[PDB]
Design a protein around this nucleic acid. Structure first.
Lengths: 58, 100, 76, 126, 191, 64, 146
RNA sequence: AAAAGACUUCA
RNA sequence: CUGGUUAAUUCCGUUAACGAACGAGACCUCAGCCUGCUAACUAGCUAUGCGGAGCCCUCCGCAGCUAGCUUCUUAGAGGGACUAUGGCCGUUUAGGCCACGGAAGUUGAGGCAAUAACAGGUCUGUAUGCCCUUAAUGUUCUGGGCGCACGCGCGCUACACUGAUGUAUCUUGGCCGACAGGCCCGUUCAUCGUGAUGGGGAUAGAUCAUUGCAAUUGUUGGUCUUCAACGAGGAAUGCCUAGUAAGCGCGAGUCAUCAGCUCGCGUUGACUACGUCCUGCCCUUUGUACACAC
C-alpha cells in the first residue's frame, strides 16, 4: 500500500544526475487524493506543470 | 536464457535434441487399439463435456494425438453425429459434440 | 521400363551401363568402383581423389573444411 | 440519366464509376465482388459503406480497377461513391465527412540511392 | 446496428479496468472503431495523451514480425483472426476483451533501465509510460506464442490463443505474465 | 501529341578507385513528338520542308 | 435458376468451379494420352498417377475458364501460368515445368470435339459450343456458394 | 566528479 | 566575440564596423505533384452494333480514327499553401502546438555540396614529364593459369507452420518433345505431424542439349541418384526514425558464357523516435612545453 490516484503534477526535480537534462527521480504529488508525496522514478527530463499518471504505483 | 557452447575449428555447438515420439500414427490408426473405441471416446468424447467446443489443434495438443490421426477419428464421429465440425483454411477449425 | 548396357562389348572399364536403376547399395558399391576407377586410369578426376580435393569445382576462396580436414590451427 | 463520376486516386491503379442506382450488387472487371476478392479482410473495407449508412438499396456500384496487386484495390474504390453523394445532398455531407476520405498517401515506394542493399540501408561494411 | 470487425465481434462492449491504461487503449476511433488494416502518420508528441490506437492493429503487427523471418501481415492478420476465434471458442467471451485482460496482466507497472554514472552501473528502476506497457506486454505474448509454435505441434494461431488465455488468467505458464512479474520483481527490488 | 519517355541513366562511382558511395545519377531524357496532318497535300509537304525550324530538333518526313 | 448461372460462369472462385466442371468433363469420349505423359512431366511429385481426378481434368477445365475472358490465347499462354521458372538463388530450384508437350495435348482433344478453333496468328478463340458447356455448368456452382 | 599504458629514424 | 533561433556566419536583435563572395537555402529534379481544365490520342470509359451466353432483361468478346470526352497517357499553365485568414503567454524577430485542405515553414529522398589540405588513391576508368629502350617490357597466335592444410571480408541459401509441396489464384502462332530444344509461317485445398524429416540442398558419380573451336583445374540448365554441415549462432557489429528497416521478384547494364555483381523499379510491409544520457562533429572557452602534429 501506497494509493493510486488519477493524474499527478511534478512538484520539483528532486535533484538527481543532470548536468544537461535529467534522467533520474522526481518528487510528485497526487493531483486528486492530495497530500501523499512520494518520489517516483521516471526516464527523461520534465518540466513542473507536466501532468502524468504514475499509474499503479503501489 | 542461454544458448549452448561455441564452435571449434570445424565447427559449432548446438546442445538440444528432444522428448520423443510415438503416436507415429496411421499404423496405429489402422489396427484396432487406438481406432476402435478408446481414442474416440477417451480423447474426443471425454474432453468435450468439460468444454463444449474446442479447436481441433488444441485437441491435438492436449490429447497428444496426431492431427491426422484424430482427423480420421473426428470424421467417424461426425458421421455418427456425435460431433459437428465447422471449417477453416489451415485445416484448423472447431470441434463440438452437441449444440446444447 | 527396362535399362541395359549395350553398345559393342568393347570398352573395358567404366561406362554407364545404362543408368543403374537399380539405385541404392548397388549404386553405393559402384560409386566406389567409379572412385577407384579414375585413379588407375590416371585421369584428372582420379588424380584428385588420391589427393582428396573436391572434384567438380568449388569456390575455394573459403569452405572446404570437410574436403580435407578441420580447421588446422594457423599454418606455417 | 444517372451517372456521376468524380475521380479520386490514391495509390497506382484507376477506378472509373458510372453508377445507376438500384439493388446492392458490386462488380469489378465487370465480375461479382466477393468472389473476385475471395479470402480477404481488406476486401470488406470497401463493403463498409454499402452497409453502414442505413442505405443498402440505393447504390449498385459498377467498378473497374486495372493494374497492381490485390491489396491496393479497396482504398480508392470507396472514395468515389461518397464524393458524388455530397454534391447533391448537403445533409449527407455528413456521410462523406465522418466516414474518412482523402489521402493521396504519397508514401508509395521511395528512391534508391546508391550504396543501399535495399536502397537506404547502406552496406554492413563499408 | 450490424457490427463489423471481421464481421463477427463487437468492441464498444470491451471494458478496460485500469483507468490509467484505459485512456491510452483506443477501442473507439473518430466515428467509432473498426479493425481493417492501414497505417496513418500521427508521430510522437510528449508529456500528454498523444496518439490514437488500436490494440488489434499492434497485436497482428507484433505477430508478422516476432518471430521470425519470412511472414507477412496478410498471414499475420490471418493468424490473429484464427487466434481470436480459437480464443472465443475456449473462453466463450469476446476475444478483444480477452486480449485486454492479457495486456493489463502482461503490462508491468515499473521497469529497470541501465545507467552508467560515476565509476559503476546502476539500475534504479523507471517509469514505463503507458504505450510502452501495452507493447512490452503484447510482445511478450507474441514472443511466447512464437516460441511455443517453434517447439510444439500447435498452430500459433492456437499458440497465440494459448499464450493469450494463460496471460488473460494470470497463469505463470504464460511467457508474457511470467516476464511481467519478473520485471516488476527486479524494478521493485533495485532501489 | 507528345508521347512516352526514353531514359538511359548510368551511375558510376566515377572512380577512385576505391570509390563506392556518393555515386551518380546524371540522368538523360530524350523526348518524341509525333504530329499528323489530316490531308498530306503536295502543297503541305513543300511549304513545311523549305522553312523547317529545327536547331537541335531532328525531324523525318515519312513514308508508307 | 439461370440467373446465378450465367454470370457465375465468369465471376466464381475457381476452386469450386474447376472441381464442379471436371466431373462434367469426364463423360466425354476422348482423353487419349498416347503414353506421352509418363517420362517425367511436371513439377516434382507430379508424374500422372494421381491425375484421373487431380491433373488431367482440372487442367482441361483449366484452359476453359481462361479462354473465355482472356482470348485470343496460345500455347505459350498456357505453358507459363502455373509455372515458376524463376531465376534461381542457385541453392534452389524450385520446380521445372515443360510445357509445350503439356499444352499441346489438352488443345488437340478439344478441337476434335469442336470446342476450340485457331486463328492464323491470334491463337485459338471460343466457339458457340465451348461457351455452351462452360456457362451451363457455372450455373450449378453459384448456388452451392450462396 | 573520470577504468584504461604504448605508438622506430629523417624528411 | 555576444543575445536568440534554426539542418543551415539560416535569419533577426545587438556590436568598431560597413560591406562583399562562396557554400547552404533558392534552383532544375522526382515522389501524390493532384486538381477542375487548355492540348491530343496511345489507352480508358461510354455510346451504338454483332457473334452468342443465362433464362438487348443480365453478361463476355471484338467491330468502325464511328461519336465524344478522361481518371490512364501526355506537355503546359496554374494550384501551390504564403502565416494572405483566425488562435495562444511572450525584451523583441521567434520558438512550441493546432485547423481549412491533396499537403505547412527543417513536406520528403538526397541527385544540384564550399575552398583547401590529405607526397591519400588511380600511370590500367584518361593524356603524360623521365628512364628499362629502339626493325625490345613489339608482333600475330597456339596452349596454360584467377589451386585452398588455413584467417579476414562482403554476400546467398537454411535450421522449419511468418513453413513445406501440390493444385488452383527480341519474342510469338501452333505440330513434336521430360529439362535443355529444333522448326512453318511470319491465398485455395490433398498432403505436412513439428518429424535433423515430406527439413536442408551440400557433395560426388552417370549422362543429354545448348552458347563456343573447345565446358577438364574455368559455362549454364538438367534426366537421375547420392542425401553434407547446420536444432536460429559466441567474443562481438552493422544499419533504421514508417513507406524507412526488413522481406519477395524482376529489369537494366555486365554480357559469345556466368553463379551474383553493381544499379533502379514496383509490390509486401514492422518497431522505436525521447535525447546527446561509447563514436564522429559544431562553435565559443581556457591551458598548451606540440606544430606532417596525442
Amino acid at each position: 500500500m501506497d494509493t493510486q490516484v488519477k493524474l499527478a503534477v511534478v512538484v520539483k526535480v528532486m535533484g538527481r544526475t543532470g548536468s544537461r537534462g535529467q534522467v533520474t527521480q522526481v518528487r510528485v504529488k497526487f493531483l486528486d487524493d492530495q497530500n501523499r508525496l512520494i518520489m517516483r522514478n521516471v526516464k527523461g527530463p520534465v518540466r513542473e506543470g507536466d501532468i502524468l499518471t504514475l499509474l499503479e504505483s503501489e | 536464457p542461454p544458448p549452448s557452447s561455441k564452435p571449434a575449428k570445424s565447427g559449432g555447438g548446438k546442445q538440444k535434441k528432444k522428448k520423443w515420439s510415438k503416436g507415429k500414427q496411421k499404423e496405429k490408426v489402422n489396427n484396432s487399439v487406438l481406432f476402435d473405441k478408446a481414442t474416440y471416446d477417451k480423447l474426443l468424447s471425454e474432453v468435450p463435456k468439460y468444454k463444449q467446443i474446442t479447436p481441433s489443434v488444441l485437441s491435438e495438443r492436449l490429447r497428444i494425438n496426431g492431427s491426422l490421426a484424430r482427423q480420421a477419428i473426428k470424421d467417424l464421429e461426425s458421421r455418427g453425429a456425435i460431433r459437428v465440425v465447422s471449417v477453416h483454411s489451415s485445416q484448423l477449425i472447431y470441434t463440438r459434440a452437441t449444440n446444447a | 521400363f527396362k535399362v541395359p548396357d549395350w553398345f559393342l562389348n568393347r570398352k573395358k572399364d567404366y561406362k554407364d551401363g545404362r543408368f543403374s536403376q537399380v539405385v541404392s547399395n548397388a549404386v553405393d558399391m559402384k560409386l566406389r568402383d567409379d572412385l577407384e576407377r579414375l585413379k588407375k586410369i590416371r585421369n584428372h578426376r582420379g588424380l584428385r581423389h588420391y589427393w582428396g580435393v573436391r572434384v567438380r569445382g568449388q569456390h575455394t576462396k573459403t569452405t572446404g573444411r570437410r574436403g580435407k580436414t578441420v580447421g588446422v590451427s594457423k599454418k606455417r | 440519366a444517372v451517372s456521376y463520376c468524380k475521380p479520386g486516386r490514391g495509390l497506382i491503379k484507376v477506378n472509373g464509376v458510372p453508377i445507376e442506382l438500384i439493388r446492392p450488387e458490386m462488380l469489378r472487371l465487370k465480375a461479382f465482388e466477393p468472389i473476385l476478392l475471395a479470402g480477404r479482410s481488406r476486401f470488406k473495407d470497401i463493403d463498409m459503406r454499402i452497409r453502414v449508412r442505413g442505405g443498402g438499396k440505393t447504390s449498385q456500384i459498377y467498378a473497374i480497377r486495372q493494374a497492381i496487386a490485390k491489396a491496393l484495390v479497396a482504398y480508392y474504390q470507396k472514395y468515389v461513391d461518397e464524393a458524388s453523394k455530397k454534391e447533391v445532398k448537403d445533409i449527407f455531407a455528413r456521410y462523406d465527412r465522418t466516414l474518412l476520405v482523402a489521402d493521396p498517401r504519397r508514401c508509395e515506394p521511395k528512391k534508391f540511392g546508391g550504396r543501399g542493399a535495399r536502397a537506404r540501408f547502406q552496406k554492413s561494411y563499408r | 446496428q450490424v457490427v463489423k470487425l471481421f464481421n463477427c465481434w463487437s468492441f464498444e462492449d470491451v471494458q478496460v479496468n485500469d483507468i490509467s491504461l484505459a485512456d491510452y487503449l483506443a477501442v473507439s476511433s473518430t466515428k467509432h472503431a473498426t479493425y481493417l488494416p492501414h497505417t496513418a502518420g500521427r508521430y510522437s508528441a510528449k508529456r500528454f495523451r498523444k496518439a490514437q490506437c488500436p490494440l488489434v492493429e499492434r497485436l497482428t503487427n507484433s505477430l508478422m514480425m516476432h518471430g521470425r523471418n519470412n511472414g507477412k501481415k496478410i498471414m499475420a492478420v490471418r493468424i490473429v483472426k484464427h487466434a481470436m476465434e480459437i480464443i472465443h471458442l475456449l473462453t466463450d467471451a469476446n476475444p478483444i476483451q480477452v486480449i485486454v485482460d492479457a495486456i493489463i496482466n502482461s503490462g508491468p507497472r515499473e521497469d529497470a533501465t541501465r545507467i552508467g554514472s560515476a565509476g559503476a552501473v546502476r539500475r534504479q528502476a523507471v517509469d514505463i509510460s503507458p504505450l510502452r506497457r501495452v507493447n512490452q506486454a503484447i510482445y511478450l505474448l507474441t514472443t511466447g506464442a512464437r516460441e511455443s509454435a517453434f517447439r510444439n505441434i500447435k498452430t500459433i494461431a492456437e499458440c497465440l490463443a494459448d499464450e493469450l488465455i494463460n496471460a488473460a488468467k494470470g497463469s505463470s505458464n504464460s511467457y508474457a505474465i511470467k516476464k511481467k512479474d519478473e520485471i516488476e520483481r527486479v524494478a521493485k527490488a533495485n532501489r | 501529341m507528345p508521347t512516352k519517355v526514353l531514359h538511359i541513366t548510368t551511375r558510376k562511382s566515377p572512380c577512385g578507385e576505391g570509390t563506392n558511395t556518393w555515386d551518380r545519377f546524371e540522368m538523360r531524357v530524350h523526348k518524341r513528338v509525333i504530329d499528323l496532318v489530316s490531308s498530306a497535300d503536295v502543297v503541305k509537304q513543300i511549304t513545311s520542308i523549305t522553312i523547317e525550324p529545327g536547331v537541335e530538333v531532328e525531324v523525318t518526313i515519312s513514308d508508307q | 435458376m439461370a440467373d446465378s448461372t450465367a454470370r457465375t460462369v465468369k465471376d466464381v472462385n475457381p476452386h469450386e468451379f474447376v472441381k464442379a466442371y471436371s466431373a462434367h468433363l469426364k463423360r466425354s469420349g476422348k482423353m487419349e494420352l498416347p503414353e506421352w505423359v509418363d517420362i517425367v512431366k511436371t513439377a516434382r511429385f507430379k508424374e500422372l498417377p494421381p491425375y484421373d481426378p487431380d491433373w488431367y481434368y482440372t487442367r482441361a477445365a483449366s484452359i476453359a475458364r481462361k479462354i473465355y475472358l482472356r482470348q485470343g490465347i496460345g500455347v505459350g499462354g498456357f505453358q507459363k501460368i502455373y509455372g515458376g521458372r524463376q531465376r534461381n538463388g542457385s541453392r534452389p530450384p524450385h520446380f521445372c515445368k515443360s510445357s509445350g508437350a503439356i499444352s499441346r495435348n489438352i488443345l488437340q482433344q478439344l478441337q476434335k470435339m469442336g470446342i476450340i478453333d485457331v486463328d492464323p496468328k491470334g491463337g485459338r478463340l471460343i466457339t458457340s459450343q465451348g461457351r455452351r458447356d462452360l456457362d451451363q455448368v457455372a450455373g450449378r456452382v453459384d448456388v452451392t456458394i450462396a
